[PDB]
């Protein structure tokens, strides 16, 4: 249904008149989407001819396992990904239990796209924007119950010394409403951006019930707009957490932070700091920093850290209806709902 627990209101391909197809490989996904653009007469239709619910049964563990053993050999390879360009009829790509992919999903100028239960990791082509998931000029996208991973490590001699692997979920352009939920993101250096440049500001993103572990930064690197981060489990953050920039507003509530450096900050621009409303997290005052191993660092440019752990601004009325569970409940239960193979389960107060 349209309820995603966030700003995105979409059902993807699970609508009336949808056609279900099974993909056993990346190639099939491409061929299926391509066929879905032709009407009864064999003519193409703008935005697609009919809704789709593609179930991916392929498994590329062999590619993933070989990449994991040769981390530094991935960045120079050709990037692999299925591009969903200008398809608006509605599309849901569900990975079948047991499936895995060594290719990304790149959404471009589309709408109502749902990506669920996909295990994507160690993609090749980091030097050529090999993102695991990319949302560009695409409103109403829902990235739910996926496992996005790689190795939180940078190899030597990589272009820009930042391209060993690319991001987990990059959002940019007119991707006005998006919900990123129940994802198990681990071992990723650059998790994902929310705005590709200082000029690419806006969008309303909801990050909830995501379990991040062993990640370096960008949770997200927010550029303007609104970001509602609730019920996320943030552990072992090696660089920085939510980086609220270009005057962005964030509502950080009922989250669990632990072993994290600069969990909530605004840095790198040296100006136009974003704001945050802090409520109901495991941390309530600076006295809890030592309790949960929270450390802060400075930046060479003017920056703002939430080292006082107090709200620095306001946040509009959260449009959608949601009910956050307690920070303690996410810490105790979230790991069992986030990720693939959980049958798209959701954490409720009744399970606390």
Q: Is 136 in the site for Lu ion (CB under 5 A)?
A: no
CB of 140 to Lu ion, least distance (A): 21
Binding site annotation covers 170?
A: yes
Q: Is 269 in the site for Lu ion (CB under 5 A)?
A: no
Catalytic residue flag (residue 218): yes
Instruction: Report the distance separating Cα 143 and Cα 179, nearest Å.
Output: 6
CB of 199 to Lu ion, least distance (A): 17
Q: Is 253 in the site for Lu ion (CB under 5 A)?
A: no
Q: Is 166 in the site for Lu ion (CB under 5 A)?
A: yes
Q: Is 200 in the site for Lu ion (CB under 5 A)?
A: no
Binding site annotation covers 253?
A: no
Stretches 104-112, 160-168, 211-219, 247-255: which one binds Lu ion (CB under 5 A)? 160-168
| Residue number, 14 or 152, with CB nearest to Lu ion | 152
Q: Is 167 in the site for Lu ion (CB under 5 A)?
A: yes
Q: Which of 218, 223, 245, 267 is catalytic?
A: 218
CB of 216 to Lu ion, least distance (A): 15
Q: Is 170 in the site for Lu ion (CB under 5 A)?
A: yes
CB of 274 to Lu ion, least distance (A): 21
Contact residues for Lu ion, defined by CB under 5 A: 129, 131, 166-167, 170
Positions annotated as catalytic residues are: 218
Which residue numbers belong to the known binding site? Answer: 129, 131, 166, 170
- Binding residues for Ca(2+) are 129, 131, 166, 170
């Amino acid at each position: 249904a349209t309820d995603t627990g966030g700003y995105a209101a979409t059902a993807g391909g699970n609508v009336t008149g949808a056609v279900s197809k099974t993909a056993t490989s990346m190639q099939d996904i491409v061929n299926i989407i391509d066929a879905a653009r032709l009407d009864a007469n064999g003519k193409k239709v703008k935005g697609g001819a009919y809704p789709l619910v593609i179930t991916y049964t392929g498994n590329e563990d062999s590619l993933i396992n070989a990449a994991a053993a040769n981390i530094c050999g991935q960045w120079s390879k050709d990037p692999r990904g299925v591009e969903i360009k200008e398809f608006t009829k509605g599309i849901t790509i569900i990975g079948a239990n047991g499936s895995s992919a060594n290719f990304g999903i790149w959404i471009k100028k589309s709408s109502d796209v749902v990506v669920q239960n996909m295990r994507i990791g160690y993609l090749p082509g980091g030097a050529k924007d090999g993102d695991m998931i990319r949302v560009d000029d695409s409103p109403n996208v829902w990235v739910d119950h996926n496992e996005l991973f790689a190795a939180n490590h940078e190899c030597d001699g990589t272009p820009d010394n930042d391209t060993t692997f690319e991001s987990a979920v990059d959002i940019k352009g007119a991707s006005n409403t998006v919900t990123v939920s129940y994802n198990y993101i681990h071992g990723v250096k650059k998790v994902g951006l929310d705005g590709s440049s200082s000029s690419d500001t806006g969008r309303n993103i909801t990050y909830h019930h995501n379990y991040y572990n062993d990640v370096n930064a960008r949770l997200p690197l927010q550029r303007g707009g609104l970001v509602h981060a609730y019920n996320n489990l943030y552990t072992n953050i090696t660089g920085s957490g939510l980086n609220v920039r270009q005057n962005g507003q964030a509502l950080i509530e009922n989250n669990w932070f632990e072993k994290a450096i600069n969990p909530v900050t605004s840095r790198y621009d040296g100006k136009n700091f974003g704001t945050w409303v802090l409520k109901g997290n495991n941390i309530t005052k600076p006295a809890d920093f030592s309790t949960y191993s929270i450390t802060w660092t400075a930046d060479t440019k003017p920056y703002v850290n939430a080292d006082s752990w107090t709200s620095t601004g306001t946040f509009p009325t959260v449009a959608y209806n949601y009910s956050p569970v307690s920070a303690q409940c996410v810490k105790d239960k979230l790991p069992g709902y986030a990720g693939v193979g959980k049958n798209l389960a959701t954490l409720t107060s009744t399970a606390c």
